Design a protein around this ligand. Sequence first.
Ligand code: DGD
Ligand code: CLA
Ligand code: CLA
Ligand code: CLA
Ligand code: CLA
Ligand code: BCR
Ligand code: BCR
Ligand code: BCR
Ligand code: OEX
Ligand code: CL
Ligand code: CL
Ligand code: FE2
Lengths: 35, 76, 336, 36, 56, 348, 31, 25, 449
Amino acid sequence: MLTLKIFVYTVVTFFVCLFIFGFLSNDPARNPGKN
Amino acid sequence: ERPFSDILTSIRYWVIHSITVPALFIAGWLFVSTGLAYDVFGTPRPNEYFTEDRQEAPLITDRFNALEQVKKLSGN
Amino acid sequence: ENSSLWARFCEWITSTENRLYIGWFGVIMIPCLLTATSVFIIAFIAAPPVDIDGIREPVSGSLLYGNNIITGAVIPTSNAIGLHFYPIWEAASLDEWLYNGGPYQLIVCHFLLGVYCYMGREWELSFRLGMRPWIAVAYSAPVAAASAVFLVYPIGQGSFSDGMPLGISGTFNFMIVFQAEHNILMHPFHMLGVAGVFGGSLFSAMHGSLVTSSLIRETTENESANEGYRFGQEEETYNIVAAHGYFGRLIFQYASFNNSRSLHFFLAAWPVIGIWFTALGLSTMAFNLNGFNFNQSVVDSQGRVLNTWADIINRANLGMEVMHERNAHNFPLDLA
Amino acid sequence: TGRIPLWLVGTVVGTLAIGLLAVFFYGSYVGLGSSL
Amino acid sequence: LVDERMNGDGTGRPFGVNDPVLGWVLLGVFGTMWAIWFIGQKDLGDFEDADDGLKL
Amino acid sequence: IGTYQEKRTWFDDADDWLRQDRFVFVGWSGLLLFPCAYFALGGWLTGTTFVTSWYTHGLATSYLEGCNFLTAAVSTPANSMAHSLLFVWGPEAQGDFTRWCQLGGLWAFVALHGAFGLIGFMLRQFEIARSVNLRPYNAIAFSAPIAVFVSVFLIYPLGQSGWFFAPSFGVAAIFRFILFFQGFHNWTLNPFHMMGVAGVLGAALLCAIHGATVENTLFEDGDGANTFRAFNPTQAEETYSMVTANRFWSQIFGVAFSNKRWLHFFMLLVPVTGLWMSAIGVVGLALNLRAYDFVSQEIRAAEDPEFETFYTKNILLNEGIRAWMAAQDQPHERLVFPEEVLPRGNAL
Amino acid sequence: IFTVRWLAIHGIAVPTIFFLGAITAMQFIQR
Amino acid sequence: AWAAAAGAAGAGYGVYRYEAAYGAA
Amino acid sequence: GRDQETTGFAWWSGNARLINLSGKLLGAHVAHAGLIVFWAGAMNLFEVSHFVPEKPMYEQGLILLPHIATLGYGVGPGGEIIDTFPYFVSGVLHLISSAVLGFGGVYHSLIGPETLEESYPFFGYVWKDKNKMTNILGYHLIMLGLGAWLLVWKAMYFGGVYDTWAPGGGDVRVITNPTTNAAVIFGYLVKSPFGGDGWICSVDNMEDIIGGHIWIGTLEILGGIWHIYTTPWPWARRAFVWSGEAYLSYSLGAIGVMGFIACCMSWFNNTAYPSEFYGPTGPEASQSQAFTFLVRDQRLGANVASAQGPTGLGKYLMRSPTGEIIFGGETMRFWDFRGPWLEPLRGPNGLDLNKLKNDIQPWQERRAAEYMTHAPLGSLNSVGGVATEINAVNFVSPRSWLACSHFCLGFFFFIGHLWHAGRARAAAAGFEKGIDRFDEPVLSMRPLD
Ligand SMILES: CCCCCCCCCCCCCCCCCC(=O)OC[C@H](CO[C@@H]1O[C@H](CO[C@H]2O[C@H](CO)[C@H](O)[C@H](O)[C@H]2O)[C@H](O)[C@H](O)[C@H]1O)OC(=O)CCCCCCCCCCCCCCCCC
Ligand code: CLA
Ligand code: CLA
Ligand code: CLA
Ligand code: CLA
Ligand SMILES: CC1=C(/C=C/C(C)=C/C=C/C(C)=C/C=C/C=C(C)/C=C/C=C(C)/C=C/C2=C(C)CCCC2(C)C)C(C)(C)CCC1
Ligand SMILES: CC1=C(/C=C/C(C)=C/C=C/C(C)=C/C=C/C=C(C)/C=C/C=C(C)/C=C/C2=C(C)CCCC2(C)C)C(C)(C)CCC1
Ligand SMILES: CC1=C(\C=C/C(C)=C/C=C/C(C)=C/C=C/C=C(C)/C=C/C=C(C)/C=C/C2=C(C)CCCC2(C)C)C(C)(C)CCC1
Ligand code: OEX
Ligand SMILES: [Cl-]
Ligand SMILES: [Cl-]
Ligand SMILES: [Fe+2]
């Protein structure tokens, strides 16, 4: 069970860190509208 | 002519509808407060639901003889 | 080249040229809603029966345990667990997880976290396509109603066993028990929700028929009228003046919307606001606020109770509550 | 036409419409249908 | 006793860790992907002066 | 007229006065709508205000009795009137108005004038669409509220033992008719109501999506933040980008409309197909042809005392609704249940 | 003035104020 | 451009830029 | 005033006209802050006037008086109300301060300058100035930080606050030893929100509450000084939208979570929301029922340990899924309930039935029987039972009003987040009025998407 828990915490924190650092990687400039 | 906003802002509308409108509200007040609404529609007064014959809900239970039965259920 | 590994990954995640758009909400949504989808289909088909009520009687919900599509359901979590967090790794065996309603809490945690991110990427693609954002605000009304049945009503009642079962006849049990304990029909926010889906079905048929009845003659009688519209044409394929000028004579002239942009806002705002209330009505009854209780309200002289239709609803209400969860209650008050 | 302002009509008529509605909630707690 | 549990159902552990390797999972996966973002930060714009956001 | 020039009779002098473009359109249908629809609304507002239900039902249903908006109703006649039309000149009422109200005949006043009101309103929108020279799709959509009204208020009590089991015209009175169909007919389980939910609750989705997809793919045709001002209904171009709307949903939901005419007909189709199917299920319940039981799961749950599904929970809840309301829901049966014979769980 | 627009409103508005006078007196009927 | 009340100065044309061809709003 | 064609906002979105009008926007907030203080003055005195001492505080529909009672003004041992005049001073000092806030709110909305940028440069601000925005953010954290020290000073020095877990029954207790341990204070924050954890809604004593407000007081004084002397770093320029509607939407998503937290705080917690004042919780009233019929049936000659239920689990005492002796019935779901009347009967291994067959105190069965008939179920017209209950009592628990109002307010302000964060991100991008119709960006994309 602990092998499953370590695996899920690698998996979930992989996708949560994709979420967080994705919006830190200049999301508001990824618009088609120019200023 | 007269598109629903020169009527409500006109004073001749309110020299009519400040007299007929309250006298019609009072006419509705007096239709019930004189007890006439209990007589026209046959709704029982709060002292008329239970006679001394029955102390239960009425039950009509008869089709063609219901007219004189509801007179006996009401107590008239 | 100049672009890093992370930068070429960001230009692929936020790429509008994918077939299904991903976005940064889709790196949460896709592995969540493929987790909950895969464990839904396996548990709808092959899950062993579940002690929903915590009283050590199991309830079957699987196709392989004698159920059909109507009566099959993924059974909610055990009442002994309550609001406790019960993943697979907190069980001893995998069969103990299956016995105690473990699959339900794994579906519901990934489904709710997936529809919060489905709402997030409906925003995100609107921002990537240069759109105005609030399709996500419209989808927040089925999100809130999904959040009410699977999260908030379990939080208020203190167990995921009071959450909605993941099935057709399990939903019906959830509705019938809800009306006995909370009187949802007599609650105004459910009344507004019915007005949102009856109005939203009226207005879908109303707006849907006035546009269909105002189509410009473009095709013959040997081909459908849907051929007269071309995808990407810039002219406007029906007559809004003839549609407005028809509903004007139908009831009143100023009771219509001559503004098609104002028409489509009201067309969006009537279901969404109505479902916003019935999602909150369900969430206020989660905390046991309950529906209107007009029982023994009409009393004549000499202090005697005249029945009403609410007293007949109560006779239907208290028939369900003396029979729901029929072995759970040791004590006379269903406070849980 | 314009002898009385429309906003003062809509204020006053709206006030005794909200005032009449408050009588319907007052009468819901006393008298008939008050459960007492 | 009868079986083997992890025994963390209502214990209130920080981020739900009870083996210390779970905390290094949290810091390893965050730290690996902070470092990929940090090295890749040269392609995101140098928003160095003060008026350099998406503003209105 | 008629490209042969006859002389106008009194019909043509009546046809052009009825088909007049005044403030409210009367038309030929208005000789049927406006007398009937005013007396359905007038009968409902009078019956909920003054008319008792103490004799037909044994329970108070008017404002003068003590009821509010939720619990007042125009209640159905007793089960002793069978399907009597309860004309005020009928053999039951016999001219007396104050007993016709007590006999629940004012229910059938509202139900019949409401039924011929719906015919008058549906003929109204054939008549206007022929004046405006449009297509008649507004009327064809209103076949589905007439399919719901006739199958529930008229067809359903004709198959039952009387007009008693009709819905009464009220808020809490509809609610027991709803709870009557769960307890007695298991009407959630009926697959025609399931197609009725998916039509009604799927048209609410299409109303909210098409409203929000239009309002969020609008063209910038104005300068200010009020986007409602940037529209004139005599414009020839679309006010919102259908191409952006298609690409949005083809990437969110995977499947989008590309045809604007098919979209608005699909918004027409879903609530009408949903209500016509649910009307067939109420036709089936008039004869008590219920989808009550799955017999393969009743045989198993009676031969196996540990086989519990959410279905068998629903069957037990319907036994609770049936026995606990029918001493008061059906007073004509005059059934008294001693408290030990009604079903009962543990400690409730 | 007896027109169609006059008979439309006063078919609705005249009994509405009559019943609103009736329903208001029902709030003060005690028993 | 007249710089409306939430920032975001208007892109040239006024309210309903099809008033030249249609005449109303 | 102002109209539409000079702004582009209709009457129904006309507070959006004063986005870039700094002085009018100031009077908008100060007059609104007058209303929050006016409601808090008026609804306090409404609850003082309608307070009846021979009834519980939670029975009377009082939601503001339990907050002043939790501070310990005018309460005695066991939740008995000594005097009502401390609740009266709190009502007047808000009702008088609301006129002062109402005056300057009406002042800056009518007479004061429209934009206070050129005349009063200290108060002036442009929304895109990231230094001035953090400067105003730092000023208000110091106000929130010093406000959090008011609770600590009132608990440590100014009479104390009400401790419902006090030895000898609940009364006002000076919190001499607040918990400043960072492993305990920041252990609530990283705790799971689920059953047996309850994130920060399980804070079980007042020493963690007051010691936690030491931490939130110092960090906001330090975090206020941090934002006065810094500007946001370039990674924060990269992530945020720097408009005034963005800063609103940031606050709307933060405050919509806080409405959800205080929803579950008042529903579950009985330490910061004492049950003498707010009534029993959902878990408390359901556990009180099983305790009431356990004492009812010991006196009627029945071994409540050996008593088997109809399911075979145990009618009165069963075992928790982690092995604690708990109450049986459908209240097995609320086994992780702790209460100050119940915890005297509870040993290590769950409840102690030796302690529970011999040492049930008469005050515990007084209080648990009170909580059973004041369960937080009611109706919308304040009836007070299950939905199958007649019009007998007049009761909805304050916990049932506090949680239901603040889930709805917390839900709409999450919707207000989704509205304004979508709009401010799109209005800063330029396409909040619509598609440009000349360069539609879908038309420059490859089809079969
Ligand atoms: C039970 C325990 C559970 C776990 C604990 C849970 C709680 C954890 C909460 C901790 C707090 C998290 C807050 C992080 C904020 C990050 C914000 C950010 O986006 O931060 C952004 C900033 C950006 O910084 C700036 O980034 C710039 C980028 O430059 C690049 O680009 C420039 C042009 O733009 C130039 O070209 C330049 O040459 C080029 O280098 C510059 O380099 C600047 O010098 C630099 O200051 O980052 C910074 O300030 C520093 C960021 C903070 C440090 C991050 C450390 C991460 C973990 C490390 C340990 C890993 C362990 C691995 C174990 C392995 C074995 C398993
Ligand atoms: C909390 C609510 C609140 C507050 C504080 C404000 C405040 C403001 N609004 Mg907004 N507004 C609100 C709600 C609010 N509004 C709502 C609900 C709507 C929708 C109906 C609007 C719609 C709206 C529009 C359409 C506009 C404003 C504008 C304004 C500003 C100018 C006011 C003005 O010129 O009025 C003048 C009006 C009066 C003087 C009438 C008298 C009202 C007074 C102030 C009442 C005071 C009573 C009080 C008891 C006095 C106590 C005094 C004290 C000594 C005790 C002002 C800052 C305008 C703006 O943006 O300015 C640029 C504008 O155009 N508002
Ligand atoms: C949000 C916080 C909050 C909370 C938790 C409570 C809770 C309570 N209040 Mg307090 N109150 C509040 C805000 C709050 N109130 C406000 C803002 C005011 C000023 C108006 C008052 C004024 C007040 C008075 C004067 C009294 C109370 C009373 C009460 C008690 C019973 C209330 C009741 O029966 O409601 C019944 C339920 C409702 C009214 C439902 C509210 C739903 C609203 C109206 C939204 C409806 C949706 C609708 C579609 C939107 C309308 C707009 C649309 C038409 C455009 C209860 C303890 C009573 C009490 O116990 O006194 C001791 C009492 O006499 N309250
Ligand atoms: C009203 C409160 C408030 C507000 C609005 C801000 C706003 C801001 N702060 Mg300030 N700050 C505050 C209070 C506040 N601060 C206080 C009280 C302190 C002292 C502790 C600080 C100390 C501080 C520093 C030292 C810095 C900021 C910075 C910033 C900026 C970016 C923050 C950001 O993107 O975080 C994003 C947050 C993350 C990426 C962290 C991940 C969050 C996830 C959810 C995990 C959180 C785990 C954590 C333990 C909490 C767990 C519980 C949680 C689930 C509820 C922004 C201007 C930065 C800046 O530019 O300032 C110059 C910066 O460097 N703040
Ligand atoms: C503190 C929070 C806050 C603040 C400062 C603002 C500020 C603003 N909003 Mg936002 N908004 C918020 C919260 C907030 N909003 C929330 C929570 C929602 C979701 C419901 C919205 C949804 C929203 C929309 C949809 C729009 C704005 C708009 C605006 C602007 C003008 C609004 C105006 O003049 O109102 C005028 C006020 C009225 C017309 C009266 C509305 C009253 C309603 C019916 C509620 C009545 C109160 C009732 C008792 C509550 C019942 C619910 C209860 C059960 C909880 C302004 C920038 C507008 C804009 O220009 O965007 C920039 C706009 O279109 N807001
Ligand atoms: C801008 C504006 C607005 C707003 C306004 C406001 C919001 C205001 C506020 C205001 C306020 C906020 C006010 C307040 C006031 C207060 C006062 C004036 C008070 C006084 C007090 C008193 C008088 C007291 C008394 C007493 C005592 C002492 C004790 C005993 C009891 C008694 C009560 C007797 C509006 C929306 C309209 C619109 C637009 C414009
Ligand atoms: C008083 C008290 C206490 C204490 C408390 C404390 C100390 C608190 C603190 C707290 C905290 C300390 C909190 C925090 C929070 C945070 C958060 C909540 C975050 C958020 C984040 C965000 C929002 C982000 C977003 C994003 C991303 C994702 C990335 C970047 C960018 C963006 C924006 C996009 C206790 C409990 C002991 C007891 C009771 C009382
Ligand atoms: C039946 C009948 C009859 C008689 C008579 C009639 C037909 C009458 C009508 C009547 C009517 C036609 C009435 C009406 C009424 C109405 C009403 C009663 C209304 C009320 C309303 C209300 C109550 C409202 C309230 C409110 C709301 C909710 C909204 C707005 C605002 C307010 C708050 C105001 C005949 C001879 C034919 C034959 C036999 C049978
Ligand atoms: O979880 Mn599903 O339903 Ca809320 O009440 Mn007690 O717990 Mn159970 O019974 Mn009735
Ligand atoms: Cl059940
Ligand atoms: Cl129980
Ligand atoms: Fe459309």
